[PDB]
Amino acid sequence: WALPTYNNHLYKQISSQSGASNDNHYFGYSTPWGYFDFNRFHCHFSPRDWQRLINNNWGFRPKKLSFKLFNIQVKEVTQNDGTTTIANNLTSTVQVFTDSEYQLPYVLGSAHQGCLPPFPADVFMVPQYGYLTLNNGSQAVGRSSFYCLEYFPSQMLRTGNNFQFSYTFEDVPFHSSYAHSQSL
Amino acid sequence: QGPIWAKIPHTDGHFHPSPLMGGFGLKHPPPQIMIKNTPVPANPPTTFSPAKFASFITQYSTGQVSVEIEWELQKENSKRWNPEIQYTSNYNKSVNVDFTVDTNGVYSEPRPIGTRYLTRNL
Amino acid sequence: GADGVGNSSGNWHCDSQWLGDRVITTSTRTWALPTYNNHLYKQISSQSGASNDNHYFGYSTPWGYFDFNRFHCHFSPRDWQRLINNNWGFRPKKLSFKLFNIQVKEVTQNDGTTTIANNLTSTVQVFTDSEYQLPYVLGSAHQGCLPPFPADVFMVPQYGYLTLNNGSQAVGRSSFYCLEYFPSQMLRTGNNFQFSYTFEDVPFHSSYAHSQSLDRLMNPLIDQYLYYLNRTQGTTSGTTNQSRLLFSQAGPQSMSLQARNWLPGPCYRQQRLSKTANDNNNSNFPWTAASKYHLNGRDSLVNPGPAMASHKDDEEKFFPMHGNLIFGKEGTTASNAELDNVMITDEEEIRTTNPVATEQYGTVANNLQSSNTAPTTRTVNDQGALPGMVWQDRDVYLQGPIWAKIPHTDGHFHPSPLMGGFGLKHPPPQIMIKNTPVPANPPTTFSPAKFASFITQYSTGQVSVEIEWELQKENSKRWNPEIQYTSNYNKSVNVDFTVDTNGVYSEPRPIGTRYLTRNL
Amino acid sequence: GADGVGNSSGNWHCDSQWLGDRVITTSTRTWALPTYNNHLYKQISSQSGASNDNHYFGYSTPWGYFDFNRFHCHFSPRDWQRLINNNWGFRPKKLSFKLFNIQVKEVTQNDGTTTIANNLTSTVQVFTDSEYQLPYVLGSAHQGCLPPFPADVFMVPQYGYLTLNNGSQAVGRSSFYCLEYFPSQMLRTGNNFQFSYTFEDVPFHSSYAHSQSLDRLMNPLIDQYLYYLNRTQGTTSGTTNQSRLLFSQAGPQSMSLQARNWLPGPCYRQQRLSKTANDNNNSNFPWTAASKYHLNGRDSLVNPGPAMASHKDDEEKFFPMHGNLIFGKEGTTASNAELDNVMITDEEEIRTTNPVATEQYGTVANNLQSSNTAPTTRTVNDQGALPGMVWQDRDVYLQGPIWAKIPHTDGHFHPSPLMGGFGLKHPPPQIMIKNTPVPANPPTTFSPAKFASFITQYSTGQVSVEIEWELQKENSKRWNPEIQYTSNYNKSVNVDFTVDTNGVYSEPRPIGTRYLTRNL
Amino acid sequence: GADGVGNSSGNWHCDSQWLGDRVITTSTRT
Ligand SMILES: Nc1ncnc2c1ncn2[C@H]1C[C@H](O)[C@@H](COP(=O)(O)O)O1
Ligand SMILES: Nc1ncnc2c1ncn2[C@H]1C[C@H](O)[C@@H](COP(=O)(O)O)O1
Ligand SMILES: Nc1ncnc2c1ncn2[C@H]1C[C@H](O)[C@@H](COP(=O)(O)O)O1
Structure with missing residues (x-):
């Protein structure tokens, strides 16, 4: 996976175009944060496997989950003249955390893009995080919620650090x- | 290539909480995993400026991710x-092989695959 | 096992369940047994000058026998599908044989009506050739196996064997086998028969x-x-x-x-045939132009030869002159039946290891x-056979043979039955069965003459066969x-592998076994 | 094994010592690995109507692999001499594989000059096909093995395989293998890779x-x-x-x-050739007059056939049309090279058990x-093949193949690799290796499109291989x-098996193995 | 359950009685 710097490290308020559309009016925010998604079946089952499952079983379901981030590399780039040099920033970090109390708007399960490539050899770009709140047209209400992800405890990782996580599905x-x- | 699960909205009422796009509806689904590069300031002024800091070193990150799921x-x-x-x-005798890379290395899924092939009685 | 008249000597066990590492098939059928050869051993041989390469000599016994050397005897279609689509391979392991719920009926033609009644005191004789002292007549694709469909009742085949022969005559080293000279268990109604066997590696x-x-x-x-x-x-x-x-x-x-x-x-070229009856030569050459061998000045047709592929790429219409096994559809004359009445088997999965049956093999100098002589x-x-050669064997089909006894000779090569399946030094033994002769009214005066007046009667019961597969x-x-x-x-007319409007089970197509793929 | 940046992850073990009952050879070389296929899996096949008997279909992977299926990978010339001159026979026993001292370098073409720098945080992926689920592409005499000379650095070969094909097209039963779908160990600088293997009997x-x-x-x-x-x-x-x-x-x-x-x-006659380019027919017959076979309507050249002797007594100039293995001298075009540029192997020690390749076999009635017919x-x-036949197998040469995987089929005959050596059901597994893709500058805006912008980089390290020989x-x-x-x-010019004036190692002649004599 | 020819393999149980908290019905037919 590869991760850019979204929103230029800025939280930006977003909303609908001044009189562009009505049933598409919306209000929300854009965060400098990316996120991981694997809510697609082809993220896990190779075609051959899917065939084994499909042709032999009355049914199926999820049980457990283990998540791991590792072999992290932070690269910094410079446009000096007309050529881009890319070099290692070893002392640079990255921040990870998991919304386990579901205090952040759940933006998955909406068929968005940016999941894990069906093909293992394919490298992918990590999606940017954005959410929608309550809105009256292009304007917002008083009961609208602003969420800062810097206000969450997150693990900071240098090169050689890694991230662990385990989850158990419900019945x-x-x-x-x-x-x-x-x-x- | 379809969705797997979906969070069930925290409301007073639901009926048949199966995600309409299909799959597994969960009160408490796999949580969201956030990730972002920590801001690295560029050259600061020898004189103190209160103004919001805006000069940053441009940089991106890369690594591997692993996901293990157990299925009943x-x-x-x-x-x-x-x-x-x-x-x-x-x-x-066919042109290209189903679910494969092509002449210039591009993986492609030929058709959507259902799940209901075996038969049970009512 | 010994019980009474009004008490069944067994149950109906027809099921199959999978253990992921093995599968157990149980199969029960109802069988009927007449009185063959009129309780007589008869010498049989060839018609006085009817045919030469078909000259033979042997005997006909009053004994019947059980056969289940067909796959469809054990695997329902659905099961065969589970096996075929999921497993690199398979083999036999154990075997349990059971005869039970026996009933002996005697019939009388009094006037113009046949009455059938119970003979409770009558017996039946069973035994198993476990020392293989009797000629093994199974594994020759004969008829009389267990019905593919469990609801079908079947007639038990009669036992006959061939010996050594010089034309229609016999030699001095010819063997006569009496099955009454074997210890056999006699069963009344309420008696039963048990038997267990373990396959070899x-x-x-x-x-x-x-x-x-x-x-x-x-x-x-x-x-x-x-x-x-190259130049x-x-x-x-x-x-x-x-x-x-x-x-x-x-x-x-x-x-x-x-x-x-x-x-x-290896290879043994077969003649090429087309299904379109007009691509072929306007001659009758199924004998004069087909591949064959001869033992003792007797030509025999090399029907299924070494495993060779049936056709090359982009054809599928050319099949080897009898270079493969052919099954007859339900209801089709044993004598000259149309091509639309038979089912021919395609061996196109072994194209990668084996030569094509109809094509050449290669080129030799x-x-x-x-400078004087052109190459x-x-x-x-x-x-x-050659050092370095590798090959695959013939496939097995849902209705194909399972095993075959390996002839007790000084030498074998690749002891895989040529019709396909498992070759066994010591295969499931033959199970003989016959109704015990019941004499009719004897004379008040003593007659030495051979006894010939018998009460006509047949038998019926169930048979069960349980096999474990690895x-x-x-x-x-x-x-x-x-x-x-x-x-x-x-949207289809009739459902595949099913009974029809008037209750007749029919298998649509021959089913291979090679669907999954492995590397060399 | 886990250490640091400024700490070597292994040592240089290149030695060999004898135990009178066995010999242990250790061999270390330096290797370099590029980025093949640009981190892409590409479908490959035959040119639209370029050739017919050469039609093929398969895939090309971004993965490299290690090979040491050549004898000179392990035995120095002197050692080969000790082995050859003293032992009735020999065989492989154990194997230890090690990768270490890994360095990942990334390169940049800024203007007109290439700067190469360290990427310390970059990784590399290794694994071994121990279940033989990947097509075994070794034992086909390919190039990219370990250099005969220890001082020589080598480039690691790229991995590609062939599947089932109908011309330039593919079939439904064709197999696609992704190597990313295999668990593999990822290594940074200071990490290393360990592996041990035991040969079969x-x-x-x-x-x-x-x-x-x-x-x-x-x-x-x-x-x-x-x-x-006789009369x-x-x-x-x-x-x-x-x-x-x-x-x-x-x-x-x-x-x-x-x-x-x-x-x-056994025998399969080859055409006879002379080294003097004037004894031969004035035609071009290396294909139309050579021995060959055909699978699925595709002619393939029977290059090294059954083990047959190369020439009869008092000749030594006639060699079988490709009836033996041929090695190319150091520095010689892959396309039509002169006879003075190749090394042909003489199989004249097996004259006593085997027929001559070019000559007939015998005489059959x-x-x-x-009195009416002349014999x-x-x-x-x-x-x-015939009962009573005995034979010897092809020799192995200092620079010849060692082993070969025996194809997983229903049948084999004499599973000795025809090019010579040891045939193994379960041979030393394939060791895959590849540089992990490192994405370049990503867009501040999210793009779903396939990622294609990568940092160019290659890897280098040492590899060690220890084999025990009985x-x-x-x-x-x-x-x-x-x-x-x-x-x-x-008094000679250059010394045999040595580097020359400008440092280039060269093997003078192919070395056989049959110098000592045993009785029949 | 295994008996003989001239021996019945069961009896005629057709009755019903109440337990105030439950009721048991038995029914036999030819
Ligand atoms: N995907 C999914 N998740 C959860 N429940 C499901 C799902 N699909 C069907 N159901 C059924 C199962 C329960 O009987 C019922 C619970 O509804 P409740 O509203 O919880 O009383 O809803
Ligand atoms: N169906 C069957 N039965 C037995 N053996 C088989 C069969 N098919 C292939 N083979 C092979 C397996 C052994 O390696 C070899 C034994 O031959 P032998 O002549 O016993 O030394 O024959
Ligand atoms: N290189 C190699 N590997 C294995 N066996 C060899 C080899 N060379 C000769 N043989 C002989 C040894 C056995 O007697 C026979 C086994 O054949 P099978 O087909 O295994 O029954 O093959």
Whole structure:
């Protein structure tokens, strides 16, 4: 994965174009933060595997999860003349954390882009984080919420540091990997 | 290539909390993992300026990410006598191979793959 | 096992369940047994001058026998699909045989009506050739196996064997076998028969197809470090340039010239046939132009020969003259049936290890080329065995043979039954069965003459057969989906592998086994 | 193994010492690894109508791999001499593989000058195909092995494989393999890679030549007690003497008529070639007149065939049309190089067990001779396998292949790699290696498009390979000295197996293995 | 359960009685 510097390290207020559209009016914010997504099946199942699953099982479901970030490299670039040199910044850090209390607006499960490449050899760019609040047209209300991600405890990592995380899914019914041989 | 799960909105009421796009609806889904490069200030003035700091060193980050998921399976138990329909590739002499990279290395998924191939009774 | 009249001597066990590492199939059927040969051993032989390559000599016994050397005896279609689509291979392990719920019925033709009644005191005789002292008549694709469909009742086959013969006559070293000279268990109604068998170590079958080819085995990107000679004369063909010896280093380019490590399997060329009855020669050549062998001045048709592929790429219409196994559709004359009435088997998965049946084998030199002599090439149509050769064996089909006894000789080569399946030194033994003769009214005066007046009667009961199968699990890092067997989801007339309007089970197509792919 | 930047992750172990019963060779070399395919998996196939017997389909991976399937990777010339001149045979036993002292360099073309700098935080990925789930691309005599000379640095070969194909197109059963779908160890500078392997039971190689001949096996002094027929007509040819049946008892005199117990090995006649470019036919016949085979309607050249002798006595100039392995001298075009630029291998030690490659095999009868019919003789140019046949296998040379994976099929015959060496069901696994992709400057705006902007960089480090060899000791009661390999004591230009004026190592001649003699 | 020809393999249980908290119905038919 690769991660740029979004919003130029700035939190920016975003909203709808002054009279561009009505049913598309919205209000929210844009953060300098990226995020990881793997809410697609092809992130985990190779085609062949999907075939094994599909052709043999009445159903299935998730159980556990282990997340790991590692082999981190921070690169700083300079446009001196007409050529870009890229070099190592060894003393530079990166910040990670997980919304485990669900205090941040859940922006996943909306079929957005930026998930893990179906093909393992493919490198991907990490999506930028943005959220929507409550709005009256292009304007906002008083009960609108502003969320700063710097106000969350986060682990800072240098090169050679890493990030660990484990999660356990809840009791959720098996999916229907079957079709009824009878009719209502 | 579809969605897997979706957070169930924290409201007073739900009906059938299955995500409408399909998949698993969770009260408490896999949490969001935030990541960002820490700001690195560039050359500061020998004189003290209160103004917001805006001069930064441009830089990006790269690394690996790993994700391990355990899946519970519900096994097939049918007394159907005749063979059921299965997903399969075309044995036919073909151009490119399904779910593969091409002449200039670009992975491509030919068709959307369902899940309902085996048959159960009502 | 000994019980009463009004008490069943067994239950109906017809099921199958999987253990991920093995599968157990249990199969029960109802059987009926007549009185063969009228309780007589009869000498049989060939018609006085009817045919020559079909001359034979042997005997006919009053004994029946049980057969289940067909796969569909054990695997339902659905099961066969589970096996086929998931396993690198498989093999037999154990066996349990059971006869029970026996009923002996005697019939009488009084006037013009046949009454059938119970003979409770009548018996039946069973035994098993466990020392293999009787001629093994199984594994010859005969009929009389267990019905593919469990609901179908079947008739038990009669036992007969062949000996050594000189034409229609016999030799001095010919063997006569009496089955009454074997200890056998006699059963009344409420008695039953038990038997257990353990298969020997026999290699897993190939439930796979190679994803590579014997010739496409190397690295497409790198050149070899070995050199070959590719130019004998062709040079800078201008002035004073007759001939020269030039050598090229193997490249991905010279892909069929590179040094090799292995050979394809053996071959015995078959004649090529087309399904379109007009591509062929307007002659009748299924005998005069087909491949065959001869023992003791007797021509025998080499029906299924060594494992060779049926057709080359972009054809699929040309099948070897009997170079493969053929199954007859449900309801089809045993005598000259149409091509639309039979099912021919395609062996196109072994294209990568084996030569094509109809095509040549290769090219051999047969002269000493020089400036005086032009180099001669001879097409090889027949190839014995060679160090370095590798091959695959014939497939097995849902309705194909399972095993075959390996002949007790001084020598064998690759003891795999040519019709396919598992070759066993000591296969599941033969289970003989016959109704005990019941004499009719005897004379008040003593007659020495052979007794010939018997009460006509047949028997019926259930038979159960339980086999344990070891599975070889699939372990592939293939990224893309593999080809699987499946039914047509299309709106269809009748359902595949089913009974019809008037209750008749029918198998639509022959089912192979090689759907999953493994590398060489 | 985990250490720091300024601390080496291993040492230089390049040595060999003998234990009289075994020998341990250790070999270390420096290696360099580029970025193949630009970090991309590319589908490759044959040129749209370029060639037919060379049609192929497969893929190209960004992965490199390690190879040491050459003998000179382990044995210095001097060592090979010690082995060759003293041992009835030998074989592999154990193996230790090590990667270390890794350095990742990234390069930049700024203006017209390339600066190369350290990327300390960059990684590299290694793993081993120990379950043999990847197509085995070794044992095909490819290039990119470890340099014969320890001082030579080498480039690591790129990985590519071939699948199943119908012409330039592919089939449905074709397999795509992603190497990113394998668990692999990632290494930074100061990390290292460890691996150990144990060879299977594989027969000792023949480091000997038979001192007897299949036909000169009996007692020269005594006559047999068996009789043969040597006269059919020739009698006291005077009066009334047309024909008669006469039998002679075998004698040392009738030495090639005596009853025999064994046969020579199998054969597949090759075309005969002369090194003098004027004894040959003035035609270009390296393809139309050479021996070959065909799988799936695709002709493939039978380069090294069964082990057959290269020439008969008193010749040494006639070599089989590619009937043996050929090595290219140092510095010689991969395209049509002169005969004075290659090294051809003579297989003249197996003259005693094997037929000559260029000559016939023997003589077979093919008629029923009588007074009416004259007896016909047919020259056999191709011989399968026969009970009683014995043979020797191809030699191995200092720069030859060592082992080869035995294809996972239903059948094999004599699983010895045809190019020579040790055939293994489970050979030393493939060791994959590749530089981890390092993305360049990303856009401040989110782009879903495939990432294509990468930092160019290559890797370098050392590799070590330790193999243990079991020796079969010489036990001969031969009185007279045997032939040994030796260097020319003569005043010479350059020294054999050495670097030259401008530092370039060169191997003068191919070295066989059969110098010592054993009896049949 | 295994008996003989001239021996019934069961009896006629057709009754019902109440337990104030539950009721048991037994029913037999030919
Ligand atoms: N994806 C998913 N998640 C959770 N529950 C599901 C899902 N799909 C179906 N259901 C059913 C299962 C329970 O019987 C019911 C609980 O509703 P409640 O509103 O919780 O009482 O909803
Ligand atoms: N169906 C079957 N049964 C037994 N052996 C088989 C079969 N198919 C292949 N083979 C191989 C396995 C052994 O390596 C070899 C034994 O031959 P032998 O002649 O026993 O030394 O034959
Ligand atoms: N290089 C190599 N590897 C393995 N076996 C070899 C080799 N060379 C000769 N042989 C012989 C040794 C065994 O007797 C036989 C096993 O064949 P099988 O087909 O395994 O029953 O093959």
